[PDB]
RNA sequence: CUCGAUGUCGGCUCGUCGCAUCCUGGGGCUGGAGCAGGUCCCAAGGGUUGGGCUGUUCGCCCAUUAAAGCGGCACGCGAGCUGGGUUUAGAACGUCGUGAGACAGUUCGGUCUCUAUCCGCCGCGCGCGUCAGAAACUUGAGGAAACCUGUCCCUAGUACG
RNA sequence: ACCGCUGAAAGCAUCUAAGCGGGAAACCUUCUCCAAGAUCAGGUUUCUCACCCACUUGGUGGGAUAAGGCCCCCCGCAGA
């Protein structure tokens, strides 16, 4: 059922499908992409994006899927970016910033240092709540994943980093 | 099968249109021909496929 | 990981899945998790 | 920016640093290169810098060398090679007949010298590689210093390819890594390398930058 | 008596093949046999006939991306343990011409001939060839229907 | 297959290959707190000790080590070495046999030939080729070699407990 | 190996089906050495770049040479 459904635009001035490619923007940055040649995608009556595909193929279906998401991320992206709340817990670990930079007390004998590629912008809200902003929901979920990595997994204390509110399993340890 | 296919004919099918055609000309002298007449051979192919079936693929 | 020829559910969120040309079993345990070869 | 120099092997000495610890040195005598002959990506297909090196009288040398010699504008001499140069800013400071000289290094900088290490004529297994040899009793019979087996049996029947067997040794290009320069002195064109460098007394030495610092 | 080809008798003329999206058998099946001399009736199989070759865009053949990743070049060296394996994914990149005259040198006879016949043969990564002081008339790959 | 002969074990020397990995390298799970481990996965680049006993292989032991891997290659390798064992002829013990003698029973002694034709390999030349004849400097297609690892100090007696 | 991001088929989910990452003494570069007999016999240069005779006048043979080299000689820490 996804697929055979309209894109909502809240606003999309320059939308554009142009040879087989869509490129959206707006009151925010830009997006750009390429959908797999089975899929075609045109407009609704108030000009939305609708994606359609030969009917009823094993690979047509997954590839229709796929192209509904990927178009629907880019004209969410534009329009309002997406932001990964990361949090920090242990005692003595802790982020801050140097301009689009920052590092993490979290353990090591040094800092970590992850400098933040284009399109995707770094802020603490605390010295344990931080946030990994960007308008490129790959690119946005890849850097927090390389964030949340930084840390192996430790069921006994938790201590590292996190997405927020999503809580990792324990062991009782000793 | 060099000179049928300068002629667009295999040598598959021109040996078939030489058979319905009747023409008993064998490969000696078909090569040779195909060598030092290239446009009596040019003929053959011609008469070869006429004498092919329309359909050469459909079963007899 | 455990690497057997035979891998089938443990538990009833055992989700068993093809990946890459090969068949596991991906679970929430970690301890469940187990892929053929 | 990777430099060199040709030169000479003098000899090894002894000499004592500020902190009273022997360092024996071979003293390479980086007389003074003329370039000659600048290698071009787009010429020759290569960043690359020759250097010529070593006094030889001008009718020592047959005429198609000093016609080389000579549309590089450069009186004779007796060595000449390339010092190769990365891909980019290859010729930006070497000019045909700019005179290239000891201090180029600085003092406790690290090179590179290639040299060609000492002839040592048809050399045996052991000497040529390490082979232990045999007992020198115990009944061994007259293989004392010979290999050994050679290879297997029917299968494969053959000996393989790059079995260390008996043969010339020396007269390699060899290149020995991160020797320090003690020190360089501009007065008289010398460096004085810490450690062994290949080759002669005598022997055309190129000293290069050490890569790996 | 069958007519045997003289020195002299063989006239070469020379094509350029587009590799832009031709699947790489396809392209070194129709290189041999152009390069050999198969197309035209005067062959003899001791007689250098065939014309001279000049593939182009060799770095666009049409080869799946399955072989690119799998298929692999085996080259011995003759020294013990002196098997390199290349693939032909990275032979693509540094000379993916010599992937395509591979390609043709094992569709050619193994014999002597052969040796001359694969000099007639020039592969070209880029679109660009040096001999144009020819006429190399282009060459397309077409299939005679039966 | 070989009886008009394919030299048998162990050692030495030289290797080379596989990976079913002993160490070093990377990981998953743990009845993984940490230190150590257990198990499984990936990984063959390099490394993988010296002695005592025994002919030994094996094995046990000593002292180490990061580790003291397992296999193949005619149980690799005697026109390369050894010749201790086995497996000729001497002799003795036990045992069997009336005896001559016999014994995967023991014991002492007892052998190691060949000037390399061909392939192969290690080196070194001569000739020719390389679209005139030469000299110097070179590119690098493609190869070869090489690839080990410990302890201690700081981080920090911190994390963990 | 393993760990992922985005993500359908399968309204969820899933490292995968499209796509994009991280990732080891293994592989390829990088270091060292050999290397154009690499017969695809390469490149940049520099030097000579010149004649004479005869025939069946020929990418002809010779003769003479050039650049250059070899042999001879004095040797070498180069070496059978
Ligand atoms: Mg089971
Ligand atoms: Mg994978
Ligand atoms: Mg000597
Ligand atoms: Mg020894
Ligand atoms: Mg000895
Ligand atoms: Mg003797
Ligand atoms: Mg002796
Ligand atoms: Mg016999
Ligand atoms: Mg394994
Ligand atoms: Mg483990
Ligand atoms: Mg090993
Ligand atoms: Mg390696
Ligand atoms: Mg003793
Ligand atoms: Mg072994
Ligand atoms: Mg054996
Ligand atoms: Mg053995
Ligand atoms: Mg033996
Ligand atoms: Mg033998
Ligand atoms: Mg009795
Ligand atoms: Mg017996
Ligand atoms: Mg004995
Ligand atoms: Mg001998
Ligand atoms: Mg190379
Ligand atoms: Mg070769
Ligand atoms: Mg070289
Ligand atoms: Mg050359
Ligand atoms: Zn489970």
């Known amino acids: 059922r996804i697929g055979k459904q309209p894109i909502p635009v809240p606003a999309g001035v320059d939308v554009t499908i142009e040879g087989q490619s869509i490129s959206v923007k707006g009151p925010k940055g830009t997006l750009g992409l390429t959908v797999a040649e089975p899929i075609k995608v045109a407009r609704n009556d108030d000009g939305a994006i609708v994606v359609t595909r030969p009917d009823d193929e094993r690979r047509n279906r997954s590839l229709h899927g796929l192209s509904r998401t990927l178009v629907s991320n880019l004209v969410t992206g534009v329009t309002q970016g997406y932001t990964t709340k990361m949090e920090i817990f242990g005692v003595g670990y802790r982020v801050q910033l140097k301009g689009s930079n920052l590092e993490f007390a979290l353990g090591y004998s040094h800092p970590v240092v992850i400098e933040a590629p284009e399109g995707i912008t770094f802020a603490v809200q605390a010295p344990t709540k931080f946030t990994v902003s960007g308008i490129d929901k790959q690119k946005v979920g890849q850097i927090a994943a390389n964030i949340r990595r930084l840390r192996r997994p430790d069921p006994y204390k938790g201590k590292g980093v996190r997405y927020e509110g999503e809580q990792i399993r324990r062991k009782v340890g000793k | 099968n060099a000179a049928a296919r300068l002629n667009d004919i295999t040598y598959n099918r021109l040996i078939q249109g030489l058979k319905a055609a009747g023409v008993e000309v064998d490969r000696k002298n078909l090569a040779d021909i195909a060598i030092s007449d290239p446009a009596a051979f040019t003929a053959l192919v011609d008469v070869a496929r006429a004498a092919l079936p329309e359909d050469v693929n459909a079963p007899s | 990981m455990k690497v057997n020829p035979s891998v089938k559910p443990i538990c009833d969120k055992c989700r068993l899945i093809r990946r890459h040309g090969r068949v596991m079993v991906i679970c929430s345990d970690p301890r469940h998790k187990q892929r053929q070869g | 920016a990777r430099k060199g120099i040709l030169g000479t092997k003098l000899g090894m000495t002894q000499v004592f640093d500020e902190s009273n610890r022997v360092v024996p040195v071979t003293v390479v005598k980086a007389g003074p290169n003329v370039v000659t002959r600048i290698r071009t990506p787009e010429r020759d297909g290569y960043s690359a810098v020759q250097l010529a090196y070593g006094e030889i009288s001008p009718r020592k040398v047959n005429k198609p060398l000093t016609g080389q010699y000579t549309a590089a504008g450069v009186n004779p001499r007796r060595y000449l090679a390339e010092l190769r140069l990365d891909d980019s800013d290859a010729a930006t400071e070497y000019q045909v007949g700019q005179e290239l000289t000891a201090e180029i290094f600085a003092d406790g900088s690290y090179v590179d010298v290639t040299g060609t290490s000492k002839g040592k004529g048809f050399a045996g297994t052991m000497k040529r590689h390490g082979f232990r040899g045999q007992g020198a009793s115990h009944g061994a019979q007259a293989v004392h210093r010979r290999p050994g087996s050679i290879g297997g049996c029917a299968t494969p029947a053959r000996v393989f390819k790059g079995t260390r067997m008996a043969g010339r040794m020396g007269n390699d290009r060899v290149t020995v890594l991160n020797l320090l320069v003690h020190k360089v002195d501009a007065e008289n064109g010398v460096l004085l390398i810490k450690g062994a460098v290949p080759g002669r007394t005598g022997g055309l030495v190129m000293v290069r930058s050490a890569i790996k610092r | ?146």
């Open chain 5, 1 to 146: 008596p069958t007519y045997a080809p003289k020195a002299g008798d063989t006239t070469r003329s020379w094509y350029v093949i587009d590799a832009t999206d031709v699947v790489l058998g396809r392209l070194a099946v129709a290189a041999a046999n152009l390069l050999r001399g198969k197309h035209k009736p005067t062959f003899a199989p001791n007689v250098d006939g065939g014309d001279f070759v000049i593939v182009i865009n060799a770095d666009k053949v049409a080869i799946s991306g399955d072989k690119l990743q799998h298929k692999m070049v085996y080259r011995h060296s003759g020294y013990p343990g002196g098997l390199h394996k290349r693939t032909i994914g990275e032979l693509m990149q540094r000379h993916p011409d010599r992937v395509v005259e591979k390609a043709i040198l094992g569709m050619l006879p193994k014999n002597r001939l052969s040796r001359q016949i694969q000099r007639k043969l020039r592969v070209y990564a880029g679109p660009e060839h040096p001999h144009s002081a020819q006429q190399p008339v282009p060459y397309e790959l077409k299939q005679v229907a039966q």
